[PDB]
Every structure is written in C-alpha cells, then in structure tokens.
Amino acid sequence: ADTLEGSMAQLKKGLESGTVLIQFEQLYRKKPGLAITFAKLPQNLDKNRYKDVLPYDTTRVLLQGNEDYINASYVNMEIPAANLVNKYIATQGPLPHTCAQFWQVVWDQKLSLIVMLTTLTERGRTKCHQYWPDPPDVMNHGGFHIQCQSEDCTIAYVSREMLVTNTQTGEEHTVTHLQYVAWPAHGVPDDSSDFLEFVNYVRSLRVDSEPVLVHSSAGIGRTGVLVTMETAMCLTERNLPIYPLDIVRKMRDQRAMMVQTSSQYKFVCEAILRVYEEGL
C-alpha cells in the first residue's frame, strides 16, 4: 500500500517524530511461539558462540554432513511485487570446532559469496575463529582443503578469493569472501559511504537463486543491518515502497533478534532516506 515517494515521506516523519524508534523498540525480538529446541540439546550447546543467540528449529540450516547441527538460519527476503527473493544464510562466527560444519554448508550449497561483518578480535575478546588461511599458509577443515588465492583491501573491507578443495574427490570450488573490518559489534559502520558502497558491492556479486552467506560474531546485529539495506535498495530501484519495520519483522521471523540496537536501526533508516534522496 502507498508508494516509494510516500513511504519515504512517512519514514522521514517517523524519524523526526520519532515514532519509528518507538515501534522498533516495541517489536518482538523472537517470533512469538517459534520453537527453539535443537540448539539447546546437550550435544549441541557448545556449538553456539552465544548462549542467547540461537536458531529457530524451523529455519535452521541442516547439514549434509548429515543429521549434524549448526548455528545458522535460512533467511529469505521476498519482494513479491518484483517476483524476487533474496536468499541468505545468516550464521555466527564459527568456533574452532565448528569450522568443519561451516565449510560443509558452503560446499553443500556451493555458495560463491561469504560476507563477514566482524574483525577476529575486538576489545579483549575473540569474536570469530579464523577459518581461512593467511597466505602462503593453508588449512584443512573436515575434509576440506582451504587456500586463500588472493587478498586485497579498501579502508573498510578485505576482499579475498578462496579455493575449497574436497580432499576425497579432488573437486574444487571457488568462493569470494568479504570481510568488513570497520564496523564494531553493537554499533554502526565507521563510515556510512563505505557501507553503502559495500552493500552495492555485495548486490553486484550476488548470484540469483544462490544464498549469500552472511555472518558477524553472533550473526544478528550487523548482519541484520546489511539484509535490511540490501532489501531497501532492491525496492528503491523498482520504485516500490519501503517499510523498514516490516523488513526487520520478516527477518526476525526467520532468525531471532536481527538488527540489534536502536542505533543500528536508526542508522539503516537514515541510509535508506539518503539513498532515495540522492537518486531522486
């Protein structure tokens, strides 16, 4: 209902008011009534990095390493008006002993793009295990030979090409890996223009009908911001209306707590107005 021009006026009003932040604060963090059981089974507990960030049973990724478990969710953002779905797999920064499962997901679905929205360590703590090798070095995870063929960077992110080799069959798979390093946990990007640049890079790398694997440390805060922003941009180019609270709810229905702080939400809303006004 209503238009792009109209939703954007509505969004601006709500930022100025500000009712958008109130409604965000009132939005549920977990979808009422969705079971979270497998993630808390005894054999699975230590495969979670955070005790409070767990996948729903219904949307959790099933390992075709088979009847195993991983802290990862399917997250599909439908833009019905454009007949469009942007598939994601949203996951935590792997643990030393869950690395093998992380590469199993990438291999089972032949994901070609990985987006990592965290540094490995932050403020005295480990936020993610380094599951890829620093060249020249090479590493093995659960029957996968991983080598980093290429490294380049901007001020905000590192772009890496990786080669994944099945050690049984000798089959090879290539993956693009993007690590945004200028975006602290529980916060906003250090630079908004780099962020928008980055998100457009991600969209241009996206393969249709193939999920993009997106993670940060917990896989809900900064990933949620990124999924909202990519959704908004697909809508803007198609002159379709944008309702960021509907976008966040639809994410939260598939993985709990996406877009963690009010500051993150306020940030992505302002970026959405920014992109719209500069393309007008």
Partner: peptide, 8 residues
Amino acid sequence: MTGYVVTR
C-alpha cells in the same frame, strides 16, 4: 559463554 545481548 558470554551473552551477546546488550543495552544502548
């Protein structure tokens, strides 16, 4: 495990 839930 530390908790990832914060305030702000």
